[PDB]
Design an enzyme around this catalytic site. Structure first.
Site, mmCIF file in Angstrom:
data_model
loop_
_atom_site.group_PDB
_atom_site.id
_atom_site.type_symbol
_atom_site.label_atom_id
_atom_site.label_comp_id
_atom_site.label_asym_id
_atom_site.label_seq_id
_atom_site.Cartn_x
_atom_site.Cartn_y
_atom_site.Cartn_z
ATOM 1 N N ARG A 1 38.896 35.217 42.632
ATOM 2 C CA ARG A 1 38.361 36.330 42.344
ATOM 3 C C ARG A 1 39.476 37.006 41.560
ATOM 4 O O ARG A 1 40.630 37.581 41.861
ATOM 5 C CB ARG A 1 38.023 37.069 43.657
ATOM 6 N N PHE B 1 42.402 45.481 37.926
ATOM 7 C CA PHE B 1 42.442 45.912 39.359
ATOM 8 C C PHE B 1 43.207 44.710 40.084
ATOM 9 O O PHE B 1 44.418 45.060 40.402
ATOM 10 C CB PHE B 1 40.766 45.909 39.799
ATOM 11 N N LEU C 1 43.269 51.653 48.174
ATOM 12 C CA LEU C 1 43.477 50.539 48.971
ATOM 13 C C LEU C 1 44.476 50.860 50.342
ATOM 14 O O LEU C 1 44.358 50.182 51.293
ATOM 15 C CB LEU C 1 44.278 49.495 48.071
HETATM 16 C C1 LIG Z 1 34.290 34.206 56.532
HETATM 17 C C2 LIG Z 1 33.402 34.929 55.574
HETATM 18 O O1 LIG Z 1 32.386 34.388 55.152
HETATM 19 C C3 LIG Z 1 33.773 36.095 54.841
HETATM 20 C C4 LIG Z 1 33.502 36.450 53.579
HETATM 21 C C5 LIG Z 1 33.662 37.795 53.147
HETATM 22 C C6 LIG Z 1 35.277 38.037 53.382
HETATM 23 O O2 LIG Z 1 35.402 38.698 54.320
HETATM 24 N N1 LIG Z 1 36.191 37.559 52.342
HETATM 25 C C7 LIG Z 1 37.381 38.253 52.935
HETATM 26 C C8 LIG Z 1 38.291 37.076 52.864
HETATM 27 C C9 LIG Z 1 39.846 37.414 52.751
HETATM 28 C C10 LIG Z 1 38.116 36.189 54.183
HETATM 29 C C11 LIG Z 1 37.680 39.070 51.678
HETATM 30 O O3 LIG Z 1 37.757 38.628 50.395
HETATM 31 N N2 LIG Z 1 38.037 40.184 52.007
HETATM 32 C C12 LIG Z 1 38.169 41.469 50.956
HETATM 33 C C13 LIG Z 1 37.328 42.648 51.361
HETATM 34 C C14 LIG Z 1 37.358 43.706 50.668
HETATM 35 C C15 LIG Z 1 36.569 44.119 49.799
HETATM 36 C C16 LIG Z 1 36.331 45.238 49.044
HETATM 37 C C17 LIG Z 1 37.621 46.187 49.215
HETATM 38 C C18 LIG Z 1 38.378 45.855 49.959
HETATM 39 O O4 LIG Z 1 39.466 46.755 50.011
HETATM 40 C C19 LIG Z 1 38.499 44.717 50.909
HETATM 41 C C20 LIG Z 1 39.556 41.532 50.247
HETATM 42 O O5 LIG Z 1 40.434 41.903 51.376
HETATM 43 N N3 LIG Z 1 39.986 41.600 49.111
HETATM 44 C C21 LIG Z 1 41.235 42.324 48.523
HETATM 45 C C22 LIG Z 1 40.824 43.655 47.888
HETATM 46 C C23 LIG Z 1 39.755 43.515 46.887
HETATM 47 C C24 LIG Z 1 38.555 42.970 47.386
HETATM 48 N N4 LIG Z 1 38.909 41.604 48.099
HETATM 49 C C25 LIG Z 1 37.463 42.931 46.496
HETATM 50 O O6 LIG Z 1 37.348 41.649 45.801
HETATM 51 O O7 LIG Z 1 36.875 43.994 46.078
HETATM 52 C C26 LIG Z 1 35.997 43.842 45.219
HETATM 53 C C27 LIG Z 1 36.073 45.174 44.411
HETATM 54 C C28 LIG Z 1 36.686 46.417 45.314
HETATM 55 C C29 LIG Z 1 35.843 45.241 42.998
HETATM 56 C C30 LIG Z 1 35.990 46.653 42.427
HETATM 57 O O8 LIG Z 1 35.605 46.631 41.225
HETATM 58 C C31 LIG Z 1 34.454 43.806 45.828
HETATM 59 C C32 LIG Z 1 34.316 42.286 46.305
HETATM 60 C C33 LIG Z 1 33.473 42.490 47.564
HETATM 61 C C34 LIG Z 1 33.291 41.025 48.071
HETATM 62 C C35 LIG Z 1 32.734 41.189 49.326
HETATM 63 C C36 LIG Z 1 32.421 39.706 49.830
HETATM 64 O O9 LIG Z 1 31.241 39.417 50.010
HETATM 65 C C37 LIG Z 1 33.178 39.712 51.219
HETATM 66 C C38 LIG Z 1 34.583 40.222 51.016
HETATM 67 C C39 LIG Z 1 33.254 38.225 51.559
HETATM 68 O O10 LIG Z 1 34.261 37.456 50.871
#
Ligand SMILES: CC(=O)CC[C@H]1C(=O)N[C@@H](C(C)C)C(=O)N[C@@H](Cc2cccc(O)c2)C(=O)N2CCC[C@H](N2)C(=O)O[C@H](/C(C)=C/CO)C/C=C/C=C/[C@H](O)[C@H](C)[C@H]1O
Length: 165
Positions: free
Chosen positions: A55, A60, A122
């Site tokens: 990703r 960002f 964050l």
């Molecule tokens: C086991 C399973 O199937 C779970 C899948 C689910 C998930 O939990 N993924 C986890 C990984 C680590 C196992 C995950 O990845 N967590 C993200 C959660 C998150 C989402 C949005 C904000 C945030 O503070 C935390 C995570 O830790 N990161 C790091 C920081 C950025 C964030 N991902 C992100 O990508 O934010 C994007 C963002 C804020 C974009 C702004 O422009 C929006 C994406 C959302 C994705 C949702 C998934 O369906 C969910 C996480 C899934 O993977």
């Protein structure tokens, strides 16, 4: 003692792009830092070598670290599937900050992200444990291959990685 330095050699569709180096804040989050260090050397028998950044959102962050399922849903730590949030002392203060991705409280595994901006919202949501030391230009280059929704147009992999002393 001095904080450790680990590095990633990044490739794009198998072609070398460059090296990014990080300082791990072992004096602040020893448990979290040690996990990333050991995953980077490969010394416990598993780690980031050969895994990809799944990703990437320009302006960002760049997220990677799933070396078990290779699809964004996996990863594990050197202590087991999950480990606790050590503390939230450090903040996401700017480009180059290294922070742990998670799936709720106390679910740290191996997934991490590199911040390419200061993002206040964050804070308190993820454990910060390092920063880019050198190769910020390489992180910028990786961003060119991401998109608003995070899907990369090319495979960005960690071709090699380890610890520098
Ligand atoms: C086991 C399973 O199937 C779970 C899948 C689910 C998930 O939990 N993924 C986890 C990984 C680590 C196992 C995950 O990845 N967590 C993200 C959660 C998150 C989402 C949005 C904000 C945030 O503070 C935390 C995570 O830790 N990161 C790091 C920081 C950025 C964030 N991902 C992100 O990508 O934010 C994007 C963002 C804020 C974009 C702004 O422009 C929006 C994406 C959302 C994705 C949702 C998934 O369906 C969910 C996480 C899934 O993977």
């Amino acid at each position: 003692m001095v904080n450790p330095t680990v590095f990633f050699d990044i490739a794009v569709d198998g072609e070398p792009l460059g090296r990014v180096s990080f300082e791990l804040f072992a004096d602040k989050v020893p448990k979290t830092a040690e996990n990333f260090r050991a995953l980077s050397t490969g010394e416990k028998g598993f780690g980031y070598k050969g895994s990809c950044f799944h990703r990437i959102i320009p302006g960002f962050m760049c997220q990677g670290g799933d070396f078990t399922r290779h699809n964004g849903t996996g990863g594990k730590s050197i202590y087991g599937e999950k480990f606790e949030d050590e503390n939230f002392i450090l903040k996401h203060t700017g480009p180059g900050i290294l922070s742990m991705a998670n799936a709720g409280p106390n679910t740290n595994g191996s997934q991490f992200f590199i911040c390419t901006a200061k993002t206040e919202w964050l804070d308190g949501k993820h454990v910060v444990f390092g920063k880019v030391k050198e190769g910020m230009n390489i992180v910028e280059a990786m961003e060119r291959f991401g998109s608003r929704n995070g899907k990369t147009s090319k495979k960005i992999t960690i071709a090699d990685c380890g610890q520098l002393e």
